């Protein structure tokens, strides 16, 4: 329909997004950041207070 | 003319001025996301089939403002709710719309 | 189909030249033709029967 | 899309400037993407036999 | 014209007690251009 | 956690217009006629 | 996709840093422990009771 110049009739028209996704969420692991690693073998032992 | 000089681009230009002000104004505003497409926001294939037929049935295209995308919490009629906190965020207790005490 | 025998299933007199306008009308531009062998019989005779 | 459906009598007047207008939304009719599905079982007995 | 998706080809699937698996799932699909441009003639005895 | 953006597909790329119209305007009556430039608004000839 | 890369690496990397997330949820909270194994056999007689 040529009537008007409108963009509500426009045929094939594109999506135009954005190409990223700022979805950011808080990841910071203090705790885990501070602590070191001491890798094991079983699950049952203790530390003898 | 003493001052004005060219009486029409002088009011052009006031115009000019008048425009970016209400820009800056409105970006700050709260206005409402409004246009004829609701659901049928992309529809390109289709693109809206009950539009066209009248050619004249053109809504007003209002543009969602600064209150409106940060949280809301509500539509007080046509404007964004001054009244009411929002909703949370479900990633963190979170609520980035507050009414002060 | 409608004079020729009532009991054969297929092509009848030369409609396929029909056919042919109808495209022509549209800018068809085509020029490739599929057989059906079990329809064969009528290109073949085609050229006779007349 | 389509160019047009009928043009006709076309003649008008010097002066024929009352209205006039058109509209012709999009025309994406439809994709598919079909999928395909194909499976063996053999044992291993069966493989090493001959 | 022809519009693979992904490609035709085969995949081995997790065994089993002296079982083996093999597929191939195969995505196609057509497309035709400006649908009054193909004739058809479908062919009746009678009415 | 599985961090592909594989699924997502958020390049959303326009187009690529290959439409097709098949509606014929060869004209060979007027590409082979001619053409010429009249002034008034009607023309007359004697034979 | 339209602004990703795949949906299986994106949901990968999610995935490992709400495991870290989840990590460190747990390091910092109240959960105590609830299993049946009353390990008291220890101190050199390592072994599983009935």
């Not at chain 1, 509500?8 to 950011?24: C, E, H, P």
């Not at chain 4, 389509?2 to 058109?22: M, T």
Request: proline share 4%; aromatic share 6%; hydrophobic share 35%.
């Amino acid at each position: 329909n040529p009537t008007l110049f409108v963009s509500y009739d426009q045929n094939g028209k594109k999506l135009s997004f954005a190409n990223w996704i700022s979805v950011l969420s808080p990841q910071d692991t203090p705790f885990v950041s501070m602590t070191g690693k001491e890798s094991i073998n079983q699950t049952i032992f203790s530390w003898q207070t | 003319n003493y001052g004005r000089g060219r009486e029409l681009m002088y009011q052009l230009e006031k115009k000019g001025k008048e425009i970016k002000r209400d820009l800056e104004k409105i970006l700050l505003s709260g206005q409402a996301r409004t246009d004829v497409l609701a659901d049928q926001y992309l529809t390109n294939s289709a693109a809206d089939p009950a539009v066209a037929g009248l050619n004249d049935t053109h809504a007003a295209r209002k543009t969602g403002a600064f209150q409106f995308l940060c949280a809301h919490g509500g539509l007080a009629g046509g404007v964004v709710d001054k009244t009411k906190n929002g909703p949370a965020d479900p990633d963190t207790g979170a609520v980035t719309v507050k009414v002060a005490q | 189909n409608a004079s020729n025998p009532t009991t054969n299933i297929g092509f009848d007199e030369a409609d396929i030249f029909d056919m042919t306008l109808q495209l022509y009308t549209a800018g068809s531009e085509a020029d490739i033709i599929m057989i059906n062998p079990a329809h064969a019989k009528i290109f073949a005779g085609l050229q006779e029967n007349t | 899309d389509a160019l047009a459906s009928v043009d006709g009598n076309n003649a008008h007047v010097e002066g024929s400037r009352a209205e006039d207008g058109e509209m012709k939304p999009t025309v994406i009719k439809s994709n598919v993407t079909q999928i395909l599905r194909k499976v063996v079982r053999v044992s291993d007995t069966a493989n090493t036999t001959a | 014209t022809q519009m693979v998706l992904r490609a035709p080809k085969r995949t081995e699937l997790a065994k089993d007690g002296s079982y083996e698996k093999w597929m191939i799932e195969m995505e196609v699909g057509l497309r035709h251009r400006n649908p009054y441009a193909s004739g058809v003639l479908f062919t009746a005895a009678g009415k």
